[model samples]
Target: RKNVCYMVLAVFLSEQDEVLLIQEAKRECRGSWYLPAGRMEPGETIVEALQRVVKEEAGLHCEPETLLSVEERGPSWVRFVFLARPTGGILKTSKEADAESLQAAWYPRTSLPTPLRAHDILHLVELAAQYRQQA
Candidate 1:
């Protein structure tokens, strides 16, 4: 067992002003919407975990643009948030749903679907949006 674990979250935005999201299918947060995120494996790096989670959950290959934020709980449970872009891959459909997620899609950043797993995502989304343009 490791003394510390790392989690990665990806906030993938589109030029159409939408954000990529996945529908959870697990018992605790079933049917809720959330960004692509997952726990890192024992031997993988931070970016590798982020990429793998996005592909597995959202069914899209993503390119992480920057590290947006980091959250930690007494240093053992740490989460790295990132701003990323979808490079290419088929979006996950309901028929393709798995234990990881129910499906994936793009939603208007300003009007994401309800039942989000956590309200903490809102701030991260806004941070990504604001970082995109200022001129």
Candidate 2:
């Protein structure tokens, strides 16, 4: 038997040419940086999941502007990537030690932080950049 997990990721861009990212606080990936993302919960639409994940992980209210890409690996993983823009909300990270993210910050697209959750984010960033240029 196989299990498939549907997840969503956000490539949140600011007008300042920065992307929002979160530092993992989980023990296994502590201190590593990645785009704000997580699995979709039951009874939510794709856009709802995107908004929820961004709020939980990055502490910002955001709206998905476009679906950047869809990626799958094997048969167990499928991810939806979106280009989003912040709407409003206090920018913050979980204060709890066991929170999903330790901190949230914006980094220049040209110089992302080390130890990314995956290199896949690079391409997602590029897609967002292109989308912004066309906007």
TM-score per prediction, in order, is: 0.94, 0.89
Worst 10 residues of 1 by lDDT: 126-135
Candidate lDDT scores, in order, read: 0.90, 0.86
In terms of lDDT, model 1 sits at 0.90
- Report the lDDT tens digits of candidate 1 across residue range 46-133: 9999999999999998888989899984559999999998888899999999999999989999989989998889988988888887
Task: Name the best candidate (by TM-score).
Answer: 1
Candidate 2 C-alpha error for residue 4, in Å: 3.4
Task: Estimate the Cα RMSD of every predicted model relative to the unseen true structure.
Answer: 1.4, 2.1
Off by over 4 Å in 2: 1-3, 93-98
